[PDB]
Every structure is written in structure tokens, then in C-alpha cells.
Enzyme design. Structure first.
Site, PDB file in Angstrom:
ATOM      1  N   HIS A   3      36.744 125.682  78.214  1.00 36.49           N
ATOM      2  CA  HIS A   3      37.685 127.167  78.239  1.00 36.49           C
ATOM      3  C   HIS A   3      37.394 127.567  77.458  1.00 36.49           C
ATOM      4  O   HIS A   3      37.008 127.698  76.094  1.00 36.49           O
ATOM      5  CB  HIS A   3      39.251 127.285  78.610  1.00 36.49           C
ATOM      6  CG  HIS A   3      39.313 128.734  78.808  1.00 36.49           C
ATOM      7  ND1 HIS A   3      39.233 129.161  80.134  1.00 36.49           N
ATOM      8  CD2 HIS A   3      39.461 129.758  78.564  1.00 36.49           C
ATOM      9  CE1 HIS A   3      39.942 130.309  80.039  1.00 36.49           C
ATOM     10  NE2 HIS A   3      39.936 130.886  78.638  1.00 36.49           N
ATOM     11  N   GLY A   4      36.480 129.202  77.340  1.00 32.36           N
ATOM     12  CA  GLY A   4      35.358 130.132  76.854  1.00 32.36           C
ATOM     13  C   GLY A   4      36.498 130.813  77.144  1.00 32.36           C
ATOM     14  O   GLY A   4      36.044 131.403  77.811  1.00 32.36           O
ATOM     15  N   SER A   5      36.253 131.775  76.036  1.00 27.38           N
ATOM     16  CA  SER A   5      36.657 133.381  76.326  1.00 27.38           C
ATOM     17  C   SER A   5      36.186 134.665  75.032  1.00 27.38           C
ATOM     18  O   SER A   5      35.234 133.721  74.133  1.00 27.38           O
ATOM     19  CB  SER A   5      38.440 133.731  76.115  1.00 27.38           C
ATOM     20  OG  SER A   5      38.669 135.061  76.175  1.00 27.38           O
ATOM     21  N   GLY A  20      45.584 136.259  71.418  1.00 25.60           N
ATOM     22  CA  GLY A  20      46.523 136.217  71.920  1.00 25.60           C
ATOM     23  C   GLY A  20      46.273 134.657  72.832  1.00 25.60           C
ATOM     24  O   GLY A  20      48.247 134.553  73.180  1.00 25.60           O
ATOM     25  N   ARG A  75      46.990 131.922  80.200  1.00 23.29           N
ATOM     26  CA  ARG A  75      48.343 132.981  80.613  1.00 23.29           C
ATOM     27  C   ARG A  75      47.822 133.541  82.613  1.00 23.29           C
ATOM     28  O   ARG A  75      46.263 133.536  82.896  1.00 23.29           O
ATOM     29  CB  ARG A  75      48.728 134.076  80.879  1.00 23.29           C
ATOM     30  CG  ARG A  75      49.707 134.134  79.383  1.00 23.29           C
ATOM     31  CD  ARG A  75      49.536 135.689  78.415  1.00 23.29           C
ATOM     32  NE  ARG A  75      48.458 135.150  77.774  1.00 23.29           N
ATOM     33  CZ  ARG A  75      47.671 136.097  77.250  1.00 23.29           C
ATOM     34  NH1 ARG A  75      47.889 137.444  77.365  1.00 23.29           N
ATOM     35  NH2 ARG A  75      46.314 135.927  76.325  1.00 23.29           N
ATOM     36  N   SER A 102      31.649 127.435  80.256  1.00 27.66           N
ATOM     37  CA  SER A 102      32.245 128.231  79.841  1.00 27.66           C
ATOM     38  C   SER A 102      32.250 128.908  78.679  1.00 27.66           C
ATOM     39  O   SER A 102      32.904 129.660  78.724  1.00 27.66           O
ATOM     40  CB  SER A 102      33.990 127.017  79.306  1.00 27.66           C
ATOM     41  OG  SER A 102      34.261 126.432  80.577  1.00 27.66           O
ATOM     42  N   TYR A 152      31.141 132.543  78.923  1.00 22.29           N
ATOM     43  CA  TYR A 152      32.815 133.392  78.756  1.00 22.29           C
ATOM     44  C   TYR A 152      32.562 133.591  77.422  1.00 22.29           C
ATOM     45  O   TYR A 152      33.736 134.611  77.297  1.00 22.29           O
ATOM     46  CB  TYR A 152      33.454 133.099  79.715  1.00 22.29           C
ATOM     47  CG  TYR A 152      33.611 133.270  80.919  1.00 22.29           C
ATOM     48  CD1 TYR A 152      33.648 134.055  81.642  1.00 22.29           C
ATOM     49  CD2 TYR A 152      32.438 131.878  81.109  1.00 22.29           C
ATOM     50  CE1 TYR A 152      32.893 134.079  82.800  1.00 22.29           C
ATOM     51  CE2 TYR A 152      32.777 132.023  83.184  1.00 22.29           C
ATOM     52  CZ  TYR A 152      32.670 133.052  83.935  1.00 22.29           C
ATOM     53  OH  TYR A 152      32.167 133.024  85.252  1.00 22.29           O
ATOM     54  N   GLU A 185      34.360 124.660  89.001  1.00 23.45           N
ATOM     55  CA  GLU A 185      34.846 124.888  87.845  1.00 23.45           C
ATOM     56  C   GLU A 185      36.646 124.173  88.830  1.00 23.45           C
ATOM     57  O   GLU A 185      36.820 123.669  89.895  1.00 23.45           O
ATOM     58  CB  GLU A 185      35.053 126.181  88.374  1.00 23.45           C
ATOM     59  CG  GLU A 185      35.165 127.203  89.249  1.00 23.45           C
ATOM     60  CD  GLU A 185      34.614 128.818  89.064  1.00 23.45           C
ATOM     61  OE1 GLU A 185      35.431 128.887  89.332  1.00 23.45           O
ATOM     62  OE2 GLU A 185      33.386 128.660  89.237  1.00 23.45           O
TER      63      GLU A 185
HETATM   64  O1  LIG Z   1      41.898 131.737  82.969  1.00 24.25           O
HETATM   65  C1  LIG Z   1      41.557 132.315  83.545  1.00 24.25           C
HETATM   66  C2  LIG Z   1      39.736 133.335  84.399  1.00 24.25           C
HETATM   67  C3  LIG Z   1      39.010 132.991  83.850  1.00 24.25           C
HETATM   68  C4  LIG Z   1      37.667 133.252  84.270  1.00 24.25           C
HETATM   69  C5  LIG Z   1      36.706 133.170  84.109  1.00 24.25           C
HETATM   70  C6  LIG Z   1      36.139 131.859  83.211  1.00 24.25           C
HETATM   71  N1  LIG Z   1      36.330 132.147  81.392  1.00 24.25           N
HETATM   72  N2  LIG Z   1      35.742 131.037  80.823  1.00 24.25           N
HETATM   73  C7  LIG Z   1      35.738 129.721  81.524  1.00 24.25           C
HETATM   74  O2  LIG Z   1      36.022 128.437  80.777  1.00 24.25           O
HETATM   75  C8  LIG Z   1      36.207 129.702  82.529  1.00 24.25           C
HETATM   76  C9  LIG Z   1      35.054 128.799  83.460  1.00 24.25           C
HETATM   77  C10 LIG Z   1      35.130 127.950  84.574  1.00 24.25           C
HETATM   78  C11 LIG Z   1      35.247 129.293  85.197  1.00 24.25           C
HETATM   79  C12 LIG Z   1      35.846 130.662  84.784  1.00 24.25           C
HETATM   80  C13 LIG Z   1      35.621 130.395  83.716  1.00 24.25           C
HETATM   81  C14 LIG Z   1      37.783 133.723  85.687  1.00 24.25           C
HETATM   82  C15 LIG Z   1      39.296 134.196  86.053  1.00 24.25           C
HETATM   83  C16 LIG Z   1      40.487 133.542  85.312  1.00 24.25           C
HETATM   84  F1  LIG Z   1      41.486 133.764  85.651  1.00 24.25           F
HETATM   85  N3  LIG Z   1      42.223 133.397  83.463  1.00 24.25           N
HETATM   86  C17 LIG Z   1      42.414 134.680  83.269  1.00 24.25           C
HETATM   87  C18 LIG Z   1      42.890 135.200  82.315  1.00 24.25           C
HETATM   88  N4  LIG Z   1      43.769 134.329  81.182  1.00 24.25           N
HETATM   89  C19 LIG Z   1      44.701 135.467  80.028  1.00 24.25           C
HETATM   90  O3  LIG Z   1      45.077 134.843  79.351  1.00 24.25           O
HETATM   91  C20 LIG Z   1      45.086 136.994  80.568  1.00 24.25           C
HETATM   92  C21 LIG Z   1      45.993 137.277  80.355  1.00 24.25           C
HETATM   93  C22 LIG Z   1      45.673 136.644  81.551  1.00 24.25           C
HETATM   94  C23 LIG Z   1      43.250 133.270  80.910  1.00 24.25           C
HETATM   95  C24 LIG Z   1      43.399 132.112  82.365  1.00 24.25           C
END
Ligand SMILES: O=C(c1cc(Cc2n[nH]c(=O)c3ccccc23)ccc1F)N1CCN(C(=O)C2CC2)CC1
Length: 357
Positions: free
Chosen positions: A206-208, A215, A222, A248, A251, A336
Site C-alpha cells: 500500500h502506497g500513500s 493518520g 480506514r 502502490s 500513490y 488490485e
Molecule cells: O485504500 C484506499 C484507497 C486507495 C486508492 C488508491 C491506491 N492507493 N495506494 C495503493 O497502494 C493502491 C493499490 C492498489 C489500488 C489503489 C491504490 C484508491 C481507493 C481507495 F479506497 N483507501 C482510501 C484512503 N484511505 C484512508 O484511510 C482515508 C481515510 C479514508 C486508506 C484506504
């Protein structure tokens, strides 16, 4: 000599210190939001509240409604310009642009999720002036999440390095990644909440954004806000993972300018996957007993090369063709995986990555 001082004071490990300083850097958050076009002059981050953020999501939802009804003009205008009033942007002298596609809606959601995490961050890093505790120790305790640095000569480090490199996708060749350091993660409560019973437990990426880690570590990954537009979510409001490191790492939104990002590895209790070939924001309602959604990619790691790490399957690369091709349209390049309850996630490793552009 910082090594000696650390040893006599028996202060937090210096690698942890550098990690905490990095993720808690409020100036970095200000720069990140400015790059996202948020107007930090007109609405300072320090004065941001969760009611403010929720009112943003609400305006975004009205915008979604307009797009859905084919309405542009009055209802939309009332919507778009109102979003912007609640979540001030800095467009300089340019006409503030309309939000009219899924991806524009998505960008605004990412902005609001980031703001939400910064709001958490700014509260978390509040220190007691007179406390005898070092500020960093105060931040770290407030995370309620253990971070332990791992020996680079360990087997854990070697396998995570191979995972990182071997599953870097061929289509993400704008950068390579160098693993700078590796931490074990133990978030309070996650071990006892976790769905140990479920089959198909995999260690996934998971990337952010850099703004978000405080957070994510303090509160967990979340489920998205209830008022967030559903169209922002390719397979619904779950927690998203990749088996390809770079999918990931995209992101992280790192750049040549800010080339240091983090990647998370977590155990993910997939259970039985509902496999889908293309986007459906309503995917959560299709589970019907199954435990996760699998968005099926054209290329994936193959089972012949898997390894297991403390009970979770690690899908080492390289990636090869899956024989999967949507005839109805545009298939995903890579898999994914989405789960819809935090109890299907146990964070396990945090990688500090240098991006080589
Ligand atoms: O996992 C996601 C998320 C990520 C993405 C993009 C993404 N981000 N990062 C990844 O590693 C990834 C991997 C595969 C596919 C998408 C991604 C798109 C929709 C989503 F709901 N979340 C939404 C944002 N997150 C939060 O905690 C915020 C508070 C709501 C964490 C959970």
C-alpha cells in the site's frame, strides 16, 4: 557523535527518530497541500476542522449528483463554486475549473483525505512545553503503533528487498526504487482484531502520500468517508492493495524534487475473492458472502515463485501474463485487492524508499 549520545541517554533509536521527524513534518504537509492547489494562506492547516472537511465531501457529493443528472450550469455552479468556498483553492488569476469527470472527483477526494490526515497530524504533534519527554517520544506514543527498525543483513530485509524489486512493473519505468530502511510495524489492536481464520492471507503493498502516514499509523487504513462520492472508488469504499510494488508506489506521488517516500506492507486476509474484470464502484454489494474483491490485471506474479513470511504468502515476481483480457473494454494492467473491513488488515512493514528518477 549522535550514536554515542543516543546510547548514554538511551533515547529512541536514531532511525525511528528520523522516521518520526519525516512523517510529522508540518512544513512538508503545507508544501504538499500547496502542490495540490489548496489555499494554505486563506484556510491555514492549523485551523482546519473535521466539520470543515465533511462539508467539503458534501459539496463533492452534490457535484457527483450534477454529473449523474447530466446537469451542468445552475445546480453544478452552485455545487462546484460552493466546494471551492468550503475548501479554498489557489487558482491564481485563472477561472476556477469545473469538476466534471470521475478523475477530477478522485483528485478532490485525495485532497480531502489528505486534509483529514493532516488534521490528525497537527493535533498529534502538539507537545507539552514543560514535559520532560522528548517531543519525538510524545509523537511516537500518540501513534499507538510500534515501529522497530530491522537489521539490513536479516532474512526479513532480504525478502522484502526482493519483493520490492521483483514486482516493480514494466510499465512504471519512470523511476527505480532504492530501499533506504525498513521497520517492523505493530499497530495497537490489529493483531487481536485480525481475521486469522480467513484463507488466502497475502502480504501486499500500500502506497500513500507523505502527508498521510501519521493518520495511517495512528488510526489504521480506514474505510472512506460515508459522504465521499462513490465514483471516486473503482471497486467501492474498501482498503486497496497491490501485489506489484510500483503500482502502490505510484500513490506515494514522489517526485524528483521530493524523492523520499514510504511503502507499507500488510497482511491482508482476502478469504474468497470476488474477481472482477473492470471498474464497478458498487462492487462491495456484489460480495454475497465472499470476503474481498480482486480487480484482475493482465500481468501478475505467478505462484511458482511465491514464498511465505510468517504465515502470509509473498507473491515475488517477476510478473507474467495472466491470460486475462476483458472483451468488453479496458482491462487493468495489474491486479488490485480490496477488503471492506479494517479487521482484514494487519500492518507489518514500513519501507523508506528513495525514488530514482
Ligand atoms: O485504500 C484506499 C484507497 C486507495 C486508492 C488508491 C491506491 N492507493 N495506494 C495503493 O497502494 C493502491 C493499490 C492498489 C489500488 C489503489 C491504490 C484508491 C481507493 C481507495 F479506497 N483507501 C482510501 C484512503 N484511505 C484512508 O484511510 C482515508 C481515510 C479514508 C486508506 C484506504
Amino acid at each position: 557523535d549522535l550514536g554515542t549520545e543516543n546510547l548514554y541517554f538511551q533515547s529512541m533509536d536514531l532511525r525511528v527518530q528520523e522516521l518520526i521527524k519525516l512523517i510529522c513534518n508540518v512544513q512538508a504537509m503545507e508544501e504538499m497541500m500547496m502542490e495540490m492547489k489548496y489555499n494554505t494562506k486563506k484556510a491555514p492547516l492549523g485551523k482546519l476542522t473535521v466539520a470543515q472537511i465533511k462539508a467539503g465531501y458534501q459539496s463533492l457529493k452534490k457535484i457527483e449528483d450534477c454529473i449523474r443528472a447530466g446537469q451542468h450550469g445552475r445546480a453544478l455552479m452552485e455545487a462546484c463554486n460552493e466546494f471551492y468556498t468550503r475548501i479554498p483553492h489557489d487558482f491564481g488569476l485563472r477561472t476556477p475549473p469545473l469538476i466534471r469527470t470521475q478523475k477530477e472527483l478522485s483528485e478532490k477526494i485525495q485532497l480531502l483525505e489528505a486534509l483529514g490526515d493532516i488534521e490528525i497530524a497537527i493535533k498529534l504533534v502538539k507537545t507539552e512545553l514543560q514535559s520532560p519527554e522528548h517531543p519525538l517520544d510524545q509523537h511516537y506514543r500518540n501513534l499507538h503503533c510500534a515501529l522497530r527498525p530491522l537489521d539490513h543483513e536479516s532474512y526479513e530485509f532480504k525478502v522484502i528487498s526482493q519483493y520490492l524489486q521483483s514486482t516493480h512493473a514494466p510499465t512504471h519505468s519512470d523511476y527505480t526504487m532504492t530501499l533506504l530502511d525498513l521497520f517492523e510495524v505493530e499497530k495497537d489492536g490489529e493483531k487481536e482484531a485480525f481475521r486469522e481464520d480467513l484463507h488466502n492471507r497475502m502480504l501486499l503493498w500500500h502506497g500513500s502520500r507523505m502527508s498521510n502516514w501519521v493518520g495511517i499509523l495512528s488510526h489504521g487504513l480506514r474505510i472512506a468517508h460515508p459522504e465521499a462520492p462513490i465514483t471516486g472508488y473503482m471497486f467501492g469504499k474498501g482498503i486497496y492493495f497491490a501485489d506489484m510494488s510500483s503500482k502502490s508506489a505510484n500513490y506515494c506521488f514522489a517526485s524528483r524534487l521530493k524523492n523520499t517516500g514510504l511503502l507499507l506492507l500488510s497482511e491482508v486476509a482476502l478469504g474468497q475473492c470476488n474477481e472482477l474484470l473492470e471498474a464497478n464502484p458498487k462492487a462491495e454489494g456484489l460480495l454475497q458472502g465472499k470476503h474481498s474483491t480482486k480487480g484482475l490485471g493482465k500481468m501478475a506474479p505467478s505462484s511458482a515463485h511465491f514464498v511465505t513470511l510468517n504465515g502470509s504468502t509473498v507473491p515475488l515476481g517477476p510478473a507474467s501474463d495472466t491470460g486475462i483480457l476483458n472483451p468488453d473494454g479496458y482491462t487493468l494492467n495489474y491486479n488490485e485487492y480490496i477488503v471492506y473491513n479494517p479487521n482484514q488488515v494487519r500492518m507489518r512493514y514500513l519501507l523508506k524508499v528513495q525514488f530514482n528518477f
